[PDB]
Design an enzyme around this catalytic site. Sequence first.
Site, PDB file in Angstrom:
ATOM      1  N   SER A 187       0.855  -1.193   0.000  1.00 16.36           N
ATOM      2  CA  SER A 187       0.000   0.000   0.000  1.00 16.36           C
ATOM      3  C   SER A 187       0.880   1.229   0.000  1.00 16.36           C
ATOM      4  CB  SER A 187      -0.880   0.043   1.257  1.00 16.36           C
ATOM      5  OG  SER A 187      -1.578   1.273   1.344  1.00 16.36           O
TER       6      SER A 187
ATOM      7  N   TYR B  57      -2.335  -0.127   9.779  1.00 18.76           N
ATOM      8  CA  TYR B  57      -2.415  -0.617   8.407  1.00 18.76           C
ATOM      9  C   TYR B  57      -1.114  -0.347   7.658  1.00 18.76           C
ATOM     10  CZ  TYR B  57      -4.031  -1.154   3.569  1.00 18.76           C
ATOM     11  OH  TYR B  57      -4.179  -1.530   2.258  1.00 18.76           O
TER      12      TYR B  57
END
Lengths: 212, 212, 212, 212
Positions: free
Chosen positions: C131, C144
């Site tokens: 990501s 995350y």
Amino acid sequence: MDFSGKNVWVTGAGKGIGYATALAFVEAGAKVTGFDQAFTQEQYPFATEVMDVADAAQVAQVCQRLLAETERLDALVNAAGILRMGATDQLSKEDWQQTFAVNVGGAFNLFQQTMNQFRRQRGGAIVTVASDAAHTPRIGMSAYGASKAALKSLALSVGLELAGSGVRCNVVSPGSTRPQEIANTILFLASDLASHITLQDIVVDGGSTLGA
Amino acid sequence: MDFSGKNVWVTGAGKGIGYATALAFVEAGAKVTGFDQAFTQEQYPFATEVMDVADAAQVAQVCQRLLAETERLDALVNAAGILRMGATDQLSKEDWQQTFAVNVGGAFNLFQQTMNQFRRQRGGAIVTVASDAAHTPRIGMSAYGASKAALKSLALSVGLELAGSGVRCNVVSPGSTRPQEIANTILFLASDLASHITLQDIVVDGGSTLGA
Amino acid sequence: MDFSGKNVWVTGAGKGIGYATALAFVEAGAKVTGFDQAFTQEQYPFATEVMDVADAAQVAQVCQRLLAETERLDALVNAAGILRMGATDQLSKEDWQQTFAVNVGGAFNLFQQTMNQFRRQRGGAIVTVASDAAHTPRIGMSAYGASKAALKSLALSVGLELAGSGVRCNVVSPGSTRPQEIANTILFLASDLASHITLQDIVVDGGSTLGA
Amino acid sequence: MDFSGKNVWVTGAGKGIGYATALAFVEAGAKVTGFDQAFTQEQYPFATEVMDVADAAQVAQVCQRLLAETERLDALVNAAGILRMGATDQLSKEDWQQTFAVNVGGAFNLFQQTMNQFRRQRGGAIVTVASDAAHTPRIGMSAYGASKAALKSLALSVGLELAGSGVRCNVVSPGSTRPQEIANTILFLASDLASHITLQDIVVDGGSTLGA
């Protein structure tokens, strides 16, 4: 920090970061020579040598004279630089050329004149002042940032070339000009506190690049 | 990849990566103009324009003529470059200057001549060929690596300046010259497959930089 | 892109990027097995194996059965992941643990089960979906982003461990979920067009990280 | 360096970097509390609190008691960590889990307990000890490096969350264990000399990562 008995060179020493750093080394007890394209005032707390880093032949003459008289160069600080702004397609060719001539060619000339001294003496420290503009694209600073990226690249490459001789070579990347804070970071990197830190680049801009 | 009906410019198109990339765009159906300091052969599969990227006035004349005749520039590939090696303190001043003149000044001149076209047309793609030498210090390549770091920096800065116009601007960083593989990466970044990829730099050197 | 006669595994294949990527490999002619914690629909265009990447014992059983029947694994795509948001000091311990269990532990389990296959077959490609949150701190995505940084780190480390066997191991870092565009980048990195690209990480987020 | 009248917390203070750093803050005049999973010796020059960073409930109880008695936390140093090595596919699940539990979960627990203190007091400094393994893939350290990449990511994210409150949050990435040199870098980053340095990560490993 106690740099007493240490011999230190600082370029761009007439103003800004170079001046602040030269003054800081003086207060720490170092024997300081400051270099600049020209000196304005009549009196400085460090020895002054007129030397435009962008002028290869002048850098040659001055450095060669000075190195013949010095037993070791404990620290070299590259702090000369110019800032010329503008959109990429609006920047003048004069501004483009002078940006690179000073911001990259300057340190290149210093490195050409001082690398053998560092090899022969087998140690010491180099600190080069780049910019956070070298880390992230900044509006209006395309050429400046590019020149400062070249400077950082060159500094780490010289660091690798001098690693075998035990020379520590680091970069400081300030944001928009504070000079006393940059000087503190330079002194740290030049000190024996940072003896296992090399090829590093400390960005001093209040987190603006978000770690970049 | 099907670049049919697309207008593509490739600099350094006479040899190496530029040539391979120009040929690849031709095979993909694009209308290709190749630019170089000079052309050796008598016949090329793309339109050829003698244009030394390092020569600002020449780049001005050629680009200005060509842009008056073209409705849009779908892709610009900066693939001109020269490699001059040597220890930092041994490199000649001629080699230093030509390195920067070609490797940075070249793309700067192209950007000065093409940015308004990209703004006005509101889209398209730019791919600039740097080097893995811009990512990690390599022995004997201090100036080359530095120039290629400046080039990458400049390319991302132009990318930011053109982001509002929907132009994708990316970098490819090859290792030591393979040209067909680099061409494949350039075509990908120039294609609509990569439409949400901008300000990226893909290093194609078999992992030599270990992710750097 | 023509992956005909190639055997490809995609995790997180039930939804999002994993699904889009599995479908793309199917359209390119590959023999595709999709893996997920569970499958919702009654019919898929690829072979399906229920396998929660976070469940080490299950990954063991499934992979061991499948590898006994396959001559080579041409591409492994790690695309399983979960997103749990919140300020660092407000995030629940359950969310913290599941984030790491899936986002890092998952690929770890796959690597534990597939690395010897890659060594023995001596080639192939791994693509891992991280990501852009792994590249720059993003509001509300501390855990995350951290898990995705671990995943990227692990992926490049496995890349280094498998480099001697000729395996290419790359990362794609998407922004906020587009899945078809990510799939295009994954297919490119898995293809023979990218045969000299390894340990790289392509950020696909429209330039949001400004090159970081 | 003169941290007199400053309140400083150091985790992993029983041994290695944490111990060296706790001792250095004591010598600089700070009021130091050291935390560790357990303490071996009968006597320490700083106040000691048994607190395993990996144990969320324990961290909760200890921090909550201590914060009720302290007016401000001038510096938090996260220096707890464990190293478990092995090829990725040979590492035991116990080693994998404990690596993440300590190396990431530990700082997460501290951040969960201390972030509101930092917000309310509106300033101070956090230094987190990662590793050069987080910067470049190292043989045998896939899990360790991955956990340390997560830790660095988390630290910068917390830095962004606390930037509005004037808290400086930085990382130090040491090579293989020297502890006194790391302590010097931590003290610098925690000091008012570094007041405009945030979200930075200083690698102290003699240049091993070549600037990565």
